[PDB]
Write a structure and sequence with these properties.
Largest sheet of chain C: 6 strands, antiparallel
Number of strands of chain C: 6
Pfam families (chain A): Ribosomal_S13_N
Largest sheet of chain A: none
InterPro entries (chain A): Ribosomal_uS15, Ribosomal_uS15_arc_euk, Ribosomal_uS15_N, uS15_NS1_RNA-bd_sf
Radius of gyration of chain C: 21 Å
Structural class of chain C: alpha+beta
Helix content of chain A: 40-55%
Number of helices of chain C: 3
Chains: A mainly alpha (about 140), B alpha+beta (about 130), C alpha+beta (about 140), D alpha+beta (about 100)
Bound molecules: potassium ion, magnesium ion, zinc ion
Oligomer: part of a larger assembly
Order of helices and strands of chain C: HHEEEEEEH
Strand content of chain C: 25-35%
Family (chain A): Belongs to the universal ribosomal protein uS15 family.
Distance between the termini of chain A: 30 Å
GO molecular function (chain A): small ribosomal subunit rRNA binding; structural constituent of ribosome
Largest interface: B-C, 4 and 3 residues
Radius of gyration of chain A: 19 Å
Strand order of the largest sheet of chain C: 3-2-1-4-5-6
Strand content of chain A: under 5%
Shape of chain A: elongated
Keywords (chain A): Ribonucleoprotein, Ribosomal protein
Distance between the termini of chain C: 72 Å
RNA sequence: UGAGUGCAGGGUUCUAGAUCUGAUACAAGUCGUAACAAGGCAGCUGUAGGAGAACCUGUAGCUGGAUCA
RNA sequence: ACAGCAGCAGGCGCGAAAAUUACCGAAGCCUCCAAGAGGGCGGUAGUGAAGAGACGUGAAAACAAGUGUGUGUAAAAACCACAUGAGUAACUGGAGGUCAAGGCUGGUGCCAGCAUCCGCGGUAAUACCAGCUCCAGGAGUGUCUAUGAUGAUUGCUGCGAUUAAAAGGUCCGUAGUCGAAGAACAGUACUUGUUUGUAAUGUGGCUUAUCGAGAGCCGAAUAGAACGAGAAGAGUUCAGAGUAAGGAGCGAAGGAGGGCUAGAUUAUUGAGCAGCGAGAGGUGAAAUUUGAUGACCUGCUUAGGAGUAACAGAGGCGAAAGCGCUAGUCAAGAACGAAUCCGAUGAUCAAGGACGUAGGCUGGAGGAUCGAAGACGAUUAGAGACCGUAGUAGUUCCAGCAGUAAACGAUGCCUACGCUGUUGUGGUUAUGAGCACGGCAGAAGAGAAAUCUAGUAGGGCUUUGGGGAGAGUACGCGCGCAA
């Protein structure tokens, strides 16, 4: 089940059985690889890179053509971010809640949501600072 | 998450009680395969197919009329060859028939083979 | 607590559970040496100081014959029962008596006698059964 | 022992509900438990409609009705005989009552 | 190296004490009758006042209710 | 001046509790300068129903225990051999049920007594006190006290927690215990071989004292350690692998979920003014009470502070406590659709932290309605109560403290396996159906039943009960302004 609440949803998307090569498409390998690195330098998250490749350029799951994963390609090109993108999105939501509570101090429901959010940050931090993906003395922006 | 060897047992026990002849079992591990293959050698189950679904794994099996009950033991206790008959007398209905399965350096073996090979091991499960 | 490497947790839990048993608790945590007859001694010597009688509990209707004893080993004074038909007549003030338990698990009242916990066994070194049935005589 | 499967009230999947006040004694009772009664009563009694037909100035007239929903606590509903005690098998039967006039 | 012994303190276990206050047993004493039937104001849980005494009254809750409607 | 029996005998005390101020150039050992000397160490008997063997108390013809010789020993006694006399030898607890065995005869009349427990006796006692017959074990049988079993009433094997005793008010969270599939790898646990490691006791045997305990000889052995071996489970790693494991993100939509800003239709009270001219209120029935200083009722004006009727439900939302007028605004969450991204990030939780109806407390704002306390009127033997009149703290808001509820579906949280019909709510749809959250009615199993959040089961983790009472009380400690 869900980690912070009583949810038991089941909405996911199916991974294919085999992957082949997308011969119906209208670009070369080298063009697709160029499209990714452009979208990266403009500052898009890698989950959004995937959405665009599927929706506009017509490639499912973005790996059948490249034999390599999106984040690994960005490390080969040297475009790696300073913080992993998951930990980064958790710090953003915390900041937002603290900026709301700063002006609407009375909101007990928002107070409740903040302590849940903050717990999740530290649990994710401890993962990354074991795999050597963050400096040992990293601390939140707060 | 449930233990995979426990899940296997409850799935076949309930279906047998409901008088079904075949079932699909949904999460499979290496020792689950070896357990089922043991029940086939002693003629408790008849036909086995394994589905390679890339999501864990699953099996389809045909039950015989000879199977009354099976079960897993948790945890998997360590036993000397001196100890196994104690567990045999606790689990099985009669001195004449049924099988207690033990894991060893020589694979899965039954309580008779333990005497032949001169080896203890870890207790895994039983059927009769 | 049923894991294979859980022995320490399991042991500490199960030990703590036993204090719910009255028997284990009293031996561990009560005053087991407060009594004239009990854990300490099977019999007790003492001197008779007063003669006494008590009513039986309902629904019975009787006067039971009892004796006030000063116990040599503790300097407590206790009530004891005198068993036999004419038994009270075999005892004088300032006699020495030996005293015995009623046979329950803890020191508890037996039958219809309220609050009395011991009985007389011998008077002046001789069996009370022999005195009452006139098989033997007082030392004099 | 437990006398009714629904605890005598219609609350499910909720913590708490609004209270209402009894028509007969003003006691507080939870809305999901209160005995309810509907009334549709003519302003003019049946024994006067034959006089109304000669009293009115209009060519035809429709009498105005008055509408009410009433609420009762258990004690009042039993005492006023809106409901009655029933046998162990009858207790389970559920049927809508008539609108009063 | 040190036995013994001065003087202050602590740590333990027992024991005295004017007087006050619990509990238990009281064949059957005195005053009421609070609960068990709609027990004669349906009962019970929390909280706050009050009162010879059981208890009574406000406020929120529960049915183990006298209603599965 | 001398002296220290937890050496051997012995005495006094203390207790419910324990032997002779005995013989010893012999047996087993130790000590010396020794073909010898020493030893209360050790051996021999005496005393005692702590324990353990074998046998007497007659047979149908014909029976212990005595005695004398020899033996035996260091000297003895007992034991054994032969020979003499003979004719001796049972008690303890019971007889209503459990529990084997008498309604037998005489006394006693809720007395005297008996009875582990249940129970007997008030003049017809199979239960008391005795006589007589039976029963049980028998050189033994009763009682008291500790303990093991009884007992699955301590539960690893193996108990319980809807109503009998028993799931923390809700979340977060550390220590602790527990943790995918696929392909490979390594040997410290794990299991096993060989070798060590046990005198007595115990275990499997055989041999000699008339027999039986006894004595003598044999064989194997626990835990612990030394060196090898096997690799299923456990462990470590990898990525042309991507959970009906989790987190991040995208698209369209739904809800009394929460904070803030600005508005609203009535209603209940209070004042002003106008009309009218005698009662209004309240109850089962009435009295307190209010009205010619004009009530009540009907108009028009105003002033406040609460609340959101009907629609409205076995409907919805929230972690729980809880949430119902209309617009605008601010954050985050649940579910659904689908070829998005990362890759074990996870389950449960002592300590520690955050929320928690109502009533209560500290300070400010305010004050319509309702109303603890207090005061009256009735009713009653008495009402201090129930009913009526009136009336204060509180009831509302902001900033905090507090920490309890029949905080209940009296049913912990994850995760499984499971029959049918019907009815809802929100998305999606090959229009056949699904996914999440519910209600209802049977069935089969289950259970002491009632009934079923209770079916099946050695899955994981925490809380928790052990006949009533005393007691959720005393002492100590921690929080709180107090309660
Ligand atoms: K999600
Ligand atoms: K959790
Ligand atoms: K939560
Ligand atoms: K959860
Ligand atoms: K009795
Ligand atoms: K509630
Ligand atoms: K109802
Ligand atoms: K009452
Ligand atoms: K000495
Ligand atoms: K001595
Ligand atoms: K003795
Ligand atoms: K002898
Ligand atoms: K006898
Ligand atoms: K007799
Ligand atoms: K008689
Ligand atoms: K017990
Ligand atoms: K158990
Ligand atoms: K609590
Ligand atoms: K996955
Ligand atoms: K809003
Ligand atoms: K409050
Ligand atoms: K009053
Ligand atoms: K009066
Ligand atoms: K009143
Ligand atoms: K009032
Ligand atoms: K608080
Ligand atoms: K608090
Ligand atoms: K509580
Ligand atoms: K729910
Ligand atoms: K049960
Ligand atoms: K206290
Ligand atoms: Mg009464
Ligand atoms: Mg009453
Ligand atoms: Mg009842
Ligand atoms: Mg000696
Ligand atoms: Mg008999
Ligand atoms: Mg008898
Ligand atoms: Mg039990
Ligand atoms: Mg009860
Ligand atoms: Mg209970
Ligand atoms: Mg509880
Ligand atoms: Mg022999
Ligand atoms: Mg493995
Ligand atoms: Mg006027
Ligand atoms: Mg409305
Ligand atoms: Mg979400
Ligand atoms: Mg308040
Ligand atoms: Mg919990
Ligand atoms: Mg108890
Ligand atoms: Zn009412």
């Amino acid at each position: 089940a869900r980690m912070y609440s009583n949810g038991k949803g089941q909405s996911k998307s199916v991974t294919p059985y085999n992957l082949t090569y997308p011969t119906y498409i209208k670009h070369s390998k080298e063009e697709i690889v160029d499209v990714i690195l452009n979208l990266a330098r403009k500052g898009t998250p890698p989950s959004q890179i995937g959405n665009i490749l599927r929706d506009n350029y017509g490639v499912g799951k973005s790996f059948a053509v490249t034999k390599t994963k999106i984040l690994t390609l960005l490390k080969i090109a040297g475009l790696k971010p300073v913080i992993p993108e998951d930990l980064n999105n958790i710090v953003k939501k915390c900041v937002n809640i603290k900026a709301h509570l700063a002006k609407y101090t009375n909101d007990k429901s928002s107070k409740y949501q903040l302590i849940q959010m903050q717990s999740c940050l530290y649990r994710v931090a401890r993962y990354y600072k074991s795999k050597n993906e963050l400096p040992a003395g990293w601390k939140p922006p707060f | 998450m449930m233990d995979k060897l426990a899940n296997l047992c409850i799935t076949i026990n309930n279906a047998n009680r409901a008088q079904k002849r075949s079932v699909v079992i949904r999460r499979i591990s290496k020792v689950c395969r070896l357990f089922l293959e043991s029940m086939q050698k002693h003629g408790y189950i008849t036909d086995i197919v394994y589905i390679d679904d890339h999501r864990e794994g699953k099996a389809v099996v045909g039950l015989s009329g000879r199977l009354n009950r099976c079960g897993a033991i948790c945890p998997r206790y360590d036993v000397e060859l001196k100890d196994v008959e104690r567990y045999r007398a606790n689990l099985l209905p009669s001195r004449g028939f049924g099988h207690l399965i033990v894991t060893s350096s020589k694979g899965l073996i039954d309580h008779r083979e333990c005497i032949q090979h001169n080896t203890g091991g870890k207790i895994l499960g039983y059927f009769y | 607590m049923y894991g294979l490497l859980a022995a320490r947790n399991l042991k500490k839990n199960r030990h703590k559970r036993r204090y719910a048993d009255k028997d284990f608790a009293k031996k561990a945590r009560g005053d087991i040496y407060q009594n004239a007859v009990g854990y300490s001694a099977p019999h007790a010597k003492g001197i008779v100081t007063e003669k006494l009688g008590v009513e039986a509990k309902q629904p019975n209707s009787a006067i039971r014959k009892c004796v006030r004893v000063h116990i040599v080993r503790l300097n407590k004074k206790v009530i004891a029962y005198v068993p036999h038909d004419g038994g009270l007549n075999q005892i004088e003030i300032n006699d020495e008596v030996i005293v015995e338990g009623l046979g329950k698990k803890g020191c508890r009242s037996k039958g219809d006698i309220p609050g009395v916990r011991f009985r007389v066994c011998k008077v002046q070194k001789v069996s009370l059964k022999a005195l009452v049935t006139k098989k033997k005589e007082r030392p004099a | 022992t437990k006398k009714r499967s629904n605890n005598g009230r219609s609350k499910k999947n909720r913590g708490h509900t609004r209270c209402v006040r009894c028509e007969h004694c003003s006691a507080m009772v939870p809305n999901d438990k209160a005995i309810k009664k509907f009334v549709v009563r003519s302003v003019i009694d049946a024994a006067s409609l034959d006089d109304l037909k000669i009293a009115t100035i209009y060519e035809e007239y429709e009498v105005p009705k008055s509408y009410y929903k009433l609420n009762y606590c258990v004690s009042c509903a039993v005492h006023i005989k809106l409901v009655r005690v029933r046998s162990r098998w009858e207790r389970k039967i559920r049927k809508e009552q008539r609108v009063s006039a």
